[PDB]
Design a protein around this ligand. Structure first.
Ligand SMILES: CCCCCCCCCCCCOC[C@H]1O[C@H](O[C@H]2O[C@H](CO)[C@@H](O)[C@H](O)[C@H]2O)[C@H](O)[C@@H](O)[C@@H]1O
Ligand SMILES: CCCCCCCCCCCCOC[C@H]1O[C@H](O[C@H]2O[C@H](CO)[C@@H](O)[C@H](O)[C@H]2O)[C@H](O)[C@@H](O)[C@@H]1O
Ligand SMILES: CCCCCCCCCCCCOC[C@H]1O[C@H](O[C@H]2O[C@H](CO)[C@@H](O)[C@H](O)[C@H]2O)[C@H](O)[C@@H](O)[C@@H]1O
Ligand SMILES: CCCCCCCCCCCCOC[C@H]1O[C@H](O[C@H]2O[C@H](CO)[C@@H](O)[C@H](O)[C@H]2O)[C@H](O)[C@@H](O)[C@@H]1O
Ligand SMILES: CCCCCCCCCCCCOC[C@H]1O[C@H](O[C@H]2O[C@H](CO)[C@@H](O)[C@H](O)[C@H]2O)[C@H](O)[C@@H](O)[C@@H]1O
Ligand SMILES: c1cc2c(s1)CCOC21CCN(Cc2ccc3c(c2)OCCO3)CC1
Ligand SMILES: NC(=O)CN(CC(=O)O)CC(=O)O
Ligand SMILES: NC(=O)CN(CC(=O)O)CC(=O)O
Length: 900
């Protein structure tokens, strides 16, 4: 159930108010860009866990009571120069002084530095392990101030430039915060690689789509305004909800491409409307009423494919979904507001600037429709084989391996673990809270320790069961509430985590004690089960909402059911190739990334993104095919006509987003590589294999049941504009007798009753004409009957005139109505006066014919009606009447008033 009255209204109103539209929208988005370049200072790295999970509650209680663990913030490997040993007291004094100096200057950022180097004469075996036994390396630990991840990372980045100079610059920093800042700086590095390699390439792809500077430049400006405004929207959202770092490149990697593609399509159809003969006002309105609603539907489909991600509790996916929605909706709005008004101002000047300014699909579709199974099956089988790698698949958490294997910080983390094994631990934790409020007695701790010892698989370094599950270290920021106690122990093999936790949760607590299972493996496993638990509902919502929207678009039941599984196939094979690439490792040597399990939220994100991409492209294409079959075309020529006029623009937009995605696949953060490669793969599969070979065959074998419209769930076609409506516009419709501009009694559509002055004689002739006694008033249908009679009289007169019959037989029905209109107005001799223009019309030289007709006295005397009729001759459509300014005030009776 459409409403193009709104799109018609907006296509008119955006032309009317084009200046304030461009002003307001450009102002708002550029202001948003100023507002949102500060977005990078208000994003978070938190959002990978399930903050409603038991392990998160365990972590919160632990950090409250015992104090958050700051021992892993920054580890620094110092090694003396000149192959000196770490017991050199001069080098010891120098480096101790340097470190106390850097701590003295940044006490609001650094808590202090720990390590053997502070007390080199000590008994502590753990502290004495902070030096290698060859005594040429020793590490310190530098805890930082801060009570959330973002604040601690900001403090680390504040003190890092001076910390890095300690010991002649030969100090290697690792730990949570060096790794975190490297991982988060990959974002800015990707944005600049985009800025430098993508925008020239997409600019020249734009210029190859339109061989014109201005037409190519408009979608690029739309994309830039989209990026600016979306960063502004995201900075505004950041003041209510946390927004993840990853939301920033998603604005560029997905937002910019789609905004540019929207601009592509709208400028393309504006140019083609101008080429079809319409003026820039009608051109703007039709561009809106067609491509603007295609892009609005495109935005609705992308939002419908991204929203299910909100089912997941990870703030990561939440903020990414918000970024996608803002980018896409702002892109659509801009493309039918700033871009529409810009085109309304420019007009045909969009093509004024050529390249000189410097300072076939139908053969392909038809080859493959008489040979369908020669491509169908030998493509579906290859795609299911491309999915068989998907069964190979694992998931994991963030690691230093997410950086390239030659990354300095990753390498020093790996050398820290190499030189000092056993410090880096990820214990599971039993956190116990007494419901009531009293301290927890040692009997309860011993009980819980025994019940922890019934379960196998926990590390026992000293081979004494009594001394595993030691109490968590308690520091100066813990409340030390005696009603809460934490014990902890690492796993021998972390692959057992998922089950070990599940059995430690299966333990029954002591009487009056609540126990939460926490620790890094618990957080990761709880988040993985979060995603896996709420993934099926995600997929179902995704699928069925996409297919009901394709019900709305195609007006079919078999075509959406086909496109749904075709897109399921695209998604499956894309993910299979992605797993062959990033888990099995094929491509890891050339691209410089480590083969490893995938981030779990990336699964939901990639499902949503690739699914939305494929159904967006399939709707955009087969849309024109359903319109072809609706425009009398056959199925076959329908598939052909659909692929034909779309091909160039589809491949252009595909190439632009492929360029920016290929800019992003070089990122140092492997999650970025995975997502951008999934984009490239799904793109190249959707733009050629499925688009060219799969859909036309599959829709040929579905012969004519490709459109099955059951019940009243299909678009009936509405009132076709006719000559009655045209001249009701041009001559009015009056149901009561009146006097025209000559004082003659007229009724209906310009129907002269009599030249007599007696209104009663006019009433007599109208009573005779209508068949009843009317007292001077008729109904609408009787007026239509009188008009049909007059039209028949005018056509008979035309076919009787040697000067008019040839051109009249020449013309189509709409242009025939234009000629009958001219005859009605001025007589057949008057119309036959236009010898040259009538010949031009006869020769279908619509352009020159319109030009010559506008040079006439007819145009000068009645420019609005003459202009409408001339436009009808040019375009051969009813556009100049279907949408026009209100009404007319001077009523004059026409020639061929028919009497009987
Ligand atoms: C854009 C892509 C780049 C991705 C960058 C990812 C960098 C990875 C850095 C990992 C930092 C982990 O830090 C270790 C911390 O883990 C837990 O606490 C954390 O988990 C809780 C769940 O809510 C929060 O409440 C706490 O605030 C929060 O610190 C422990 O309780 C803390 O004792 C410990 O110190
Ligand atoms: C992915 C990131 C991986 C990063 C791995 C993290 C590396 C972990 C490094 C942590 C070093 C911990 O060691 C430092 C020592 O702190 C505590 O003692 C504190 O109070 C004592 C007073 O009696 C003083 O003597 C100590 O100097 C003082 O630190 C503990 O009681 C010791 O047991 C522990 O040895
Ligand atoms: C628009 C882009 C869409 C991308 C389409 C999907 C293709 C992605 C790239 C897939 C692998 C590309 O090849 C890149 C890799 O080639 C070789 O290895 C491959 O050839 C060896 C023969 O001995 C075998 O041993 C290895 O298993 C095998 O991976 C090199 O050893 C690697 O240095 C390099 O990384
Ligand atoms: C406070 C501010 C709130 C703003 C609210 C904004 C709501 C956004 C929804 C706007 C309604 C737009 O919906 C699109 C509507 O048009 C579709 O067809 C159109 O796309 C086809 C592609 O195939 C072309 O072929 C057709 O020419 C063309 O008519 C379908 O006919 C309708 O089923 C559908 O509903
Ligand atoms: C179908 C159309 C698709 C068009 C796609 C092309 C459009 C955008 C292409 C932009 C290419 C920019 O340059 C590519 C990259 O070269 C090196 O990369 C590094 O990558 C690995 C990471 O460790 C290691 O191999 C080396 O450190 C080093 O090679 C530079 O260090 C990067 O700064 C630079 O970004
Ligand atoms: C109206 C629509 C279109 C026009 S005019 C021109 C060609 O491109 C489309 C727009 C882009 N779209 C592809 C696409 C790209 C990225 C996506 C995505 C979909 O969906 C989910 C997140 O990321 C295909 C159709
Ligand atoms: N509209 C017309 O045909 C005007 N013609 C009149 C004619 O054909 O004799 C004059 C012209 O072509 O300059
Ligand atoms: N706008 C008017 O009513 C006057 N005119 C219309 C015009 O100037 O084009 C008379 C007509 O319709 O033939």
């Amino acid at each position: 159930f459409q409403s193009n009255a709104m799109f018609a209204w907006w296509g008119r109103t955006v032309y009317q108010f084009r200046y304030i539209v461009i002003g307001v929208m450009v102002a708002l988005c550029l202001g948003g860009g100023v507002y949102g370049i500060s977005l990078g200072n208000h994003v978070t790295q938190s959002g990978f866990y399930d903050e409603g999970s038991q392990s998160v509650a365990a972590s919160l209680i632990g950090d409250e009571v015992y104090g958050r663990d700051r021992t892993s913030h920054v580890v620094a490997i110092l090694t003396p120069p000149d192959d000196k040993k770490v017991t050199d007291k001069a080098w010891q004094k120098k480096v101790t002084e340097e470190l106390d100096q850097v701590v003295k200057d940044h006490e609001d950022q650094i808590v202090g530095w720990v390590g053997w180097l502070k007390a080199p004469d000590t008994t502590d075996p753990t502290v004495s392990a902070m030096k290698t036994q060859d005594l040429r390396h020793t590490f310190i630990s530098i805890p930082l101030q801060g009570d959330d991840d973002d604040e601690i990372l900001k403090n680390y980045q504040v003190v890092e430039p001076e910390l890095q100079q300690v010991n002649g610059g030969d100090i290697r920093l690792a730990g949570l915060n060096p790794l975190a800042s490297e991982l988060t700086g990959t974002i800015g590095e990707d944005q600049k690689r985009a800025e430098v390699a993508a925008i020239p390439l997409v600019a020249v792809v734009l210029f190859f789509v339109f061989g014109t500077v201005i037409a190519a430049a408009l979608p690029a400006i739309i994309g830039g305004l989209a990026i600016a405004g979306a960063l502004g929207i995201m900075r505004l959202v950041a003041e209510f909800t946390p927004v993840h770092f990853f939301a920033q490149p998603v604005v560029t990697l997905i937002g910019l491409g789609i905004a540019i593609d929207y601009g592509l399509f709208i400028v393309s159809r504006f140019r083609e409307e101008i080429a079809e003969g319409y003026d820039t006002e009608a051109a703007v309105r039709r561009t809106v009423m067609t491509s603007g609603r295609t892009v609005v539907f495109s935005a609705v489909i992308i939002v419908a494919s991204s929203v299910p991600l909100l089912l997941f509790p990870q703030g990561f996916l939440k903020s990414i979904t918000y970024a996608i929605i803002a980018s896409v909706m702002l892109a659509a709005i801009l493309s039918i507001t700033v871009l529409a008004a810009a085109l309304a101002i420019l007009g045909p000047r969009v093509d004024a600037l050529g390249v000189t300014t410097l300072l076939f699909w139908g053969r392909l579709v038809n080859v493959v429709m008489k040979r369908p199974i020669a491509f169908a099956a030998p493509i579906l089988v290859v795609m299911v084989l491309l999915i068989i790698p998907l069964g190979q698949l694992s998931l994991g958490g963030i690691s230093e391996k997410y950086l390239p294997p030659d990354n300095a910080v990753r390498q020093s983390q790996e050398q820290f673990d190499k030189l000092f094994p056993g410090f880096r631990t990820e214990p599971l934790t039993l956190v116990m809270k007494r419901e009531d409020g009293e301290p927890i007695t040692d009997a309860q701790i011993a009980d819980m320790r025994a019940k922890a010892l019934t379960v196998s698989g926990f590390t026992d370094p000293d081979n004494d069961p009594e001394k595993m599950w030691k109490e968590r270290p308690a520091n100066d920021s813990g409340s030390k509430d005696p009603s809460v106690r934490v014990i902890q122990n690492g796993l021998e093999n972390r692959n057992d985590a998922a089950k070990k936790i599940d059995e430690l949760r299966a333990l029954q607590p002591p009487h009056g004690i609540e126990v939460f299972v926490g620790g890094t493996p618990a957080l990761e496993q709880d988040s993985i089960h979060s995603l896996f638990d709420k993934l099926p509902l995600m997929a179902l919502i995704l699928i069925v909402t996409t297919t009901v929207l394709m019900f709305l678009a195609f007006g079919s039941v078999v075509l959406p059911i086909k496109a749904a599984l075709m897109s399921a196939l695209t998604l499956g094979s894309t993910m299979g190739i992605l797993t062959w690439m990033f888990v099995d490792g094929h491509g890891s040597g050339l691209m410089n990334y480590t083969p490893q399990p995938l981030m779990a939220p990336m699964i939901g994100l990639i499902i949503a993104v690739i699914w939305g991409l494929s159904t967006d492209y399939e709707v955009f294409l087969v849309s024109r095919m359903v319109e072809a079959r609706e425009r009398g075309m056959s199925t076959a020529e329908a598939i052909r006509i659909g692929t034909a006029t779309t091909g160039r623009l589809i491949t252009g937009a595909a190439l632009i987003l492929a360029v920016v995605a290929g800019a992003f696949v070089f990122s140092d953060l492997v999650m970025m590589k995975y997502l951008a490669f999934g984009l490239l793969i799904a793109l190249l599969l959707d733009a050629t294999i499925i688009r060219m070979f799969l859909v036309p065959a599959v829709m040929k074998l579905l012969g004519d049941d490709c459109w099955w419209a059951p019940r009243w769930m299909k678009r009936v076609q509405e009132k076709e504009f006719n000559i009655f409506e045209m001249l009701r516009i041009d001559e009015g419709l009056r149901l009561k007798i009146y006097k025209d501009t000559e004082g003659y009694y007229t009724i209906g559509i310009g129907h002269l009753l009599t030249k007599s002055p007696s209104l009663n004689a006019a009433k007599s002739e109208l009573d005779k004409a209508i068949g009843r006694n009317t007292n001077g008033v008729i109904t609408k249908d009787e007026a239509e009957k009188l008009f049909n009679q007059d039209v028949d009289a005018a056509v008979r007169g035309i076919l009787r005139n040697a000067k008019l019959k040839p051109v009249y037989d020449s013309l189509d029905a709409v242009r025939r109505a234009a000629l009958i209109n001219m005859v009605f107005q001025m007589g057949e001799t008057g119309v036959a006066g236009f010898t040259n223009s009538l010949r031009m019309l006869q020769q279908k030289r619509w352009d020159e014919a319109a030009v010559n007709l506008a040079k006439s006295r007819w145009y000068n005397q009645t420019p609005n009606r003459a202009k409408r009729v001339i436009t009808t001759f040019r375009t051969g459509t009813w556009d100049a009447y279907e949408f026009h300014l209100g009404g007319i005030k001077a009523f004059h009776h026409h020639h061929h008033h028919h009497h009987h």
